[PDB]
Amino acid sequence: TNASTNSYKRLIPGYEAPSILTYSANNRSASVRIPYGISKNSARFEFRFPDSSSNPYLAFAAILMAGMDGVKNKIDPGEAMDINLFKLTLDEIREKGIKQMPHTLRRSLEEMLADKQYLKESQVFSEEFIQAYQSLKFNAEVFPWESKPHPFEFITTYSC
Amino acid sequence: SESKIKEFFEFCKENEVEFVDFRFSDIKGTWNHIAYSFGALTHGMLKEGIPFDASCFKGWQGIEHSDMILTPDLVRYFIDPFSADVSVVVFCDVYDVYKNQPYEKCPRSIAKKALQHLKDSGLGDVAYFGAENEFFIFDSIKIKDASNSQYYEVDSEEGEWNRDRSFENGVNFGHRPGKQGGYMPVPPTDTMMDIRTEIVKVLNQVGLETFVVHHEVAQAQGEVGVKFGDLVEAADNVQKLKYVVKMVAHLNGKTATFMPKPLYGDNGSGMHTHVSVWKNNENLFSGETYKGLSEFALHFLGGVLRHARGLAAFTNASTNSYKRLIPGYEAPSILTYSANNRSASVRIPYGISKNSARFEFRFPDSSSNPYLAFAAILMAGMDGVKNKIDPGEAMDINLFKLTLDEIREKGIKQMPHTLRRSLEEMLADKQYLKESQVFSEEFIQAYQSLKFNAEVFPWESKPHPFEFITTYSC
Amino acid sequence: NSESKIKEFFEFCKENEVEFVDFRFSDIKGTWNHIAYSFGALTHGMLKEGIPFDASCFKGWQGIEHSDMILTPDLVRYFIDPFSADVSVVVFCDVYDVYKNQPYEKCPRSIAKKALQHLKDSGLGDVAYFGAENEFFIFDSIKIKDASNSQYYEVDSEEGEWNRDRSFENGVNFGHRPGKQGGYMPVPPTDTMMDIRTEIVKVLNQVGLETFVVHHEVAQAQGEVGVKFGDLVEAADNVQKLKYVVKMVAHLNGKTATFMPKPLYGDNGSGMHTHVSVWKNNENLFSGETYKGLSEFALHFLGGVLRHARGLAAFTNASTNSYKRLIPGYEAPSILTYSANNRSASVRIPYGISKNSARFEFRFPDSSSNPYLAFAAILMAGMDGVKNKIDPGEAMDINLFKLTLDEIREKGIKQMPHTLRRSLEEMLADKQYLKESQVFSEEFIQAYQSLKFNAEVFPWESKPHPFEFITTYSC
Amino acid sequence: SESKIKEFFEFCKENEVEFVDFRFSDIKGTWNHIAYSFGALTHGMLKEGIPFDASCFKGWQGIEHSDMILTPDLVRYFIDPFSADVSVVVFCDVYDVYKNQPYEKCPRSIAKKALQHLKDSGLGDVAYFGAENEFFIFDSIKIKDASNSQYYEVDSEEGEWNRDRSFENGVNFGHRPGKQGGYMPVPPTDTMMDIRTEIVKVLNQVGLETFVVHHEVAQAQGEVGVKFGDLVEAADNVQKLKYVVKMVAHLNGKTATFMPKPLYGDNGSGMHTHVSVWKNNENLFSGETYKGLSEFALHFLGGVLRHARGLAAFTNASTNSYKRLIPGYEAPSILTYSANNRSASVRIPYGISKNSARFEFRFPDSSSNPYLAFAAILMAGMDGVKNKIDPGEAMDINLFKLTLDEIREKGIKQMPHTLRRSLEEMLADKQYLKESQVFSEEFIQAYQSLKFNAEVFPWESKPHPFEFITTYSC
């Protein structure tokens, strides 16, 4: 869903972009949001963390495969947080054990590769593909961003 | 401290000194100065110290307790060669006046606490360090940090990018080292021969005995071999070395940098660090356990390699640092040792007499605080000998081989790829730093918050021009 | 001016081959003014009687019908001007009021003697020592525009973050620039002013001033020189010399200086960190053991300075530009309390605080102030404190810039005034501690009030500001 | 609300509408819109409302409770004349879904609560307001907000500053109204005759009956007389008026502004506001107590003048507002009333038939939120009649006389000189606003924090180019 390193320049607090993985009604600091209307015909979630750098097929496919694991394994989503999520400290993050979004695509691929089974159900995401997708994203996005100098390093480090 | 002070005052008198320039290093590694008109110096002013506002350095003091003291250390002082009016530079230590002890967040204070912790354990007497600081001399550097635009461009008359340019009414003199071709064509292809040579003269001018001076592999790059010194003194001369190179670049109308990786696809700058430990005039690194080295030396190495993934947070202290740790540029990404091997993290040089036995750690870069890097390495090497840490087996292959498979199937730990992972690993393994309070945990916690905000959070949050080649059309 | 001192002054001139005497005097605003006499046309009598001039040209001073006034030279701290091509000695002067046959009650330097003499007369002290740190800026360029359809300024400096991308002599940019808020204290070549700062203190000493420290400061083109403490007038005198010396040295090397409080938005302002001690019979009355090395006498002094503080801002923070600096978070005080080692506080107790050195440092004044009036008024407010045994309240050893707008009002915490208009109001509604012994005569106060409203307030309140165009243009 | 909805849906059908543009005013006064593709509109979508993210407007919602609703009010809708594809504009009300009541921080909600509070007290039935919105048409506007530079420059071919300029290869046509000379020279000195005339046509196009159109005193300035309307409807048409003038300026390649004072030394823009209160078809302002007015009307005025110093926080809501409240430009600084007097705060116009009796409050400017200004004035005028407030005596002199003395010795309150003093006074006297919860204190507290940060704190903190003329040499 966040398949470029540029995705992670967006996942920074304070721009109505989620860094904290919780749900709340009427909350644009949360990863998931319950809209106000929420009739019967309209009951739904809204996931605010995905972006258009994602392949919509893979993104939608994967979102559905992860929700279905939830129904199979009766997974509790925990407790809603009806606070301003961008106001929580780095203390309040770690101490209160609050599962935040990954900061880079590299960690996201690591997290995916270490948890790939809910996608492999019924060969929906075959393993050959996953290794291809992993190989693609490391060579297209990560290895070039990790290896091409960035102009801010020139403000920071040039004077050393 | 009043031994020195008479004499130092006498040294100022006969060098016709008008300013004493107190210099001290913040956490980041930046050299800072504050000049006192000589006539206004009393002997008592050097016991007490120099007050200053230590709230202006991130990682040090908050404004509520802003006052601090500089404690001049009257060693390696020298006349500033560049200042128009006579100035003496003196290194200084930061004294915490709220705890009435040397400042546990003073980098040079830590470096003294580490070279003492080795005295105190009995393992060694001296810890000798020897830095090769690769650097670059560009003509021009232009930067842009803004909402809609990030931008950099270094410039050098040697660069492949100028082969077609018009300089002085359209005259171009050709003769350019290629990409990675600077080692070591003669002039006029080498345009820095007199620039490097005059640097060396001024380095000697400030009390730095020099050895070798050459062009390096990358297009505008250089190096000067300076003499091994003890841990602080080694780091003291790094501060000096950089000041001279940057300032002579400046006099001749250029601009220097020791930053790790300024050019894509060309060599980065290394701080090739040479260490040996001695005791009672016997070099403890020399033995016959392995290619002229002692098992004591290999245990040291066992400790450096063991904590290296975390040690990198002090030796590779900029995000730019990791743009260099890419295979194929004589920069190590794999944590092993080998003789005469520059794909390796550590190198055993060729000479290895019982007098010159040492390691060369190739993975640090000059973006580091020299004080912290040298300090941290020694705390990692001492942990090794305490626990007689196994450094593993030598790898005498070209390490830039079988990347994906042989690394995961058989191979050993490699350097962290981003500054963030280096900090995670650092925080997850900090005891070898904390013994004898060399690295107090408040300092360690100060450095983590400072480095995430200065280095990681901006890099993770300012978009990069390559994402526009990749993703703009997404 | 005793003719023991006029004689030796004449000999100082003959053996230094002086061809012009530059009589200098300070109007109310703080501008140093001069009038040069061809030496040799100088009488012994002209140093007694004085020098005529046109005091109708100075707003707050004389009308044209009674325009003639006298300069009275004071033959102390004179100096040979290094800059003038032909040799000139500068000599200080006061205005003598010839219609009232008293030293001019609106002459700021005359006020500064009347303020220091009111102390020796009251017996509280002998000397009042002042020591100012005037932070300044050395720019490359300043461009301004005041017109019907355009307001505009631009300072420029090679060190400025705005030049990180500029093309210079042949489009070469040297890099190495301190960040916004980063000038303290990177070494060169990031520090470009090391030879300029060094050349300043060389000339400061040339003009009879002693310097201790010289460093780059926190803002991008900012600098500072520490000068020796001096008595109330002499300190204000050395401030006039210092301002001239850096302005002219910036100038000889092709630049332009300023001591104005806040030229750069988003970077540190310039302060006049003023250090006070009162001594008597060679004992330092500020040192004691009531508090961190300070006496009851000193703490009552501080309470008086703190009580009248909001009105005192009118002489120490005498431009509207002063109040762009008095914003939280740039080591500039907005909260009127004291604390040791605290740069968020209005007053600061330095760490050293020996007996000989016991002192306060007031961080709220700036160099837009007339040093005579500022020092004079600071002393008149501290003396009220000792007379009325004023308690300065309780020290606040917190980060003062961290306190909320709730924590401000609810906790009743007396903050600095936000504009010069409120500061003049606060002064005009509390003017008595200055009027003691006619030090600040009321005619002057009304002149000073009239001057500052017409020079600074009414123009700033009435000239559109470019940010209103970002805010309001789209309405 | 389903009366309208059928018909409105029928109005869209025969105007071939593809977009319905829901427009609603935040605290600042900014008009905001959100367009729905018509085909996707169900009748139910207009009962429920339009969801939106009300956390994006300072002074409204925090992100934790971001969702809100727009409640379309199906009055004064009109086809957008400018939009390429057919659009209908509809005003909207913000509904608080956490309190299930109209949003106490919705300006247009307050304006309905005030025109109801007058129904509810019995004093009056209708409150008629009539705005003259002076504005400016420039060719170009350039701004700079930065660390080292603040900068503005408007441009107009009429300005005194262009008398010597080369335009189209160096042709300059002369004929320029002087400084303050625009009232009302004929063309070609008047270059805006067709620009003003076409504005009026489009104003009629959106349901605004017009009266007069002239050049105003300042060089690029203009005005259109629009018909009195009730309190909300008056403010509704101000939103419309501004949109049209700004957009027609834009079509013809120019740029408009209703900002109070764009040019130094030239006239500012006023929102000359005309009020009368009526009941049972009898105009309550008309009487014989004073020059054709009732004592009821003078009590109203007594209340407006009494709270004016605080009322200014809503009528003069920008720091720029106070750059206009300077004597000598037909802008009031002294709070008194007078017949046929434009130095006065309030003016009794000449006509004053028992049908047209009214006041003209000259001190507001178009920088205000029209909803809040109109609302706040009525709450101040009603307090007056409750307390039968004495408005003092008329001052029929040129008020720009004897400034320093006669003001302090004999004279009455004058307008606050900065936005900050206007807010202080507002917070120190807020009851006449708070009765019947027209202005709830949370709204009043929201507006104070919003206005200090948007208007005061930037103005008090960004240096002004004139300080450089004054102080640079200090």
Author numbering:
A (entry chain B): 322 to 481
B (entry chain A), D (entry chain A): 8 to 481
C (entry chain B): 7 to 481
Per the authors:
In each subunit, N-terminal residues (Met1–Asn7 in subunit A, E, and F; Met1–Gln6 in subunit B, C, and D) and internal residues (Leu408–Gly418 in all subunits) were disordered. Six subunits in the asymmetric unit of Hpy GSapo were almost identical to each other with root-mean-square deviation (r.m.s.d.) values of 0.22–0.27 Å for 474 Cα atoms in residues 8–481. Superposition of Hpy GSapo and Hpy GSsub gave a r.m.s.d. value of 0.50 Å for 473 Cα residues (residues 9–481), and a r.m.s.d. value of 0.50 Å for 4,742 Cα atoms for dodecamer-dodecamer comparisons. The adenylation loops had higher r.m.s.d. values, which may be attributed to the disorder of the loop. This suggests that Hpy GS could exist in either the open or closed form regardless of the presence of substrates.
The GS in H. pylori (Hpy GS) is a critical enzyme that is involved in processing the ammonia released by urease activity, and nitrogen metabolism. GS is an enzyme involved in the biosynthetic reaction producing glutamine from the condensation of glutamate and ammonia. This enzyme is present in all living organisms and is a large homo-oligomeric complex composed of eight, ten, or twelve subunits assembled into two face-to-face rings. Although the structural and sequence information of Hpy GS indicate its relationship with GS I-β due to the presence of a specific 25-amino acid residues (residues 155–179), the adenylation site (NLYDLP) found in similar homologs is replaced in Hpy GS (NLF407KLT), suggesting a lack of the adenylation regulatory mechanism in Hpy GS.
